[PDB]
Amino acid sequence: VIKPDMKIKLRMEGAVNGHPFAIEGVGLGKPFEGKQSMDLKVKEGGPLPFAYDILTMAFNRVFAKYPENIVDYFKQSFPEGYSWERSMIYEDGGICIATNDITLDGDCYIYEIRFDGVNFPANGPVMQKRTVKWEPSTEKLYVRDGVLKSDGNYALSLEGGGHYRCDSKTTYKAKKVVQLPDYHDVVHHIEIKSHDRDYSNVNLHEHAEAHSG
Structure with a gap:
């Protein structure tokens, strides 16, 4: 039952160049408008010694407006849900999974x-x-x-x-x-629409829309 308004609760545990950290977040989104927003707080490892921008894409394609002519794999996956795995290779050798x-x-x-x-x-x-x-x-x-x-x-x-x-x-x-x-x-x-000086608190917005090839 994907409803027009949905809630988000998340915990990220990770490490960058061996330095561990943890982040928790709460948010809300519009599955059918492709809009979402969340507040993120650093719980462990703060202040983060790395750019926060490498994490934001890890913080759900259900929050993407799908037209009727394209199959919506993500809104179709619930209430059981789904998972994803990702690799990110940066141009200077930096790698994230x-x-x-x-x-x-x-x-x-x-x-x-x-x-x-x-x-x-x-x-x-x-x-x-x-x-x-x-x-x-x-x-x-x-x-x-x-x-x-x-x-x-x-x-x-x-x-x-x-x-x-x-x-x-x-x-x-x-x-x-x-x-x-x-x-x-x-x-x-x-x-990132707002953040304090050391990014221990971050407000993140995302907007997604599906189009045909």
């Missing part, structure tokens, strides 16, 4: 997120916190064998100009028998 197990408690999504990154150069934009925002991204979704997957070429804008590229690959796994969709795109807009 993350997972999210999404379940349902009434009208509230529950995220169990794991996030790990290594090989970020000490002088790079991530360890030095020189990232600004994610550019608008186009996610390419497709089904290979019997598995829904997605690819992405994302770009982080840097302070002082330039961009920091990231190659992303995601695997989705439904916990029930759902209709697999046909290839299509999802355009994403993600933005």
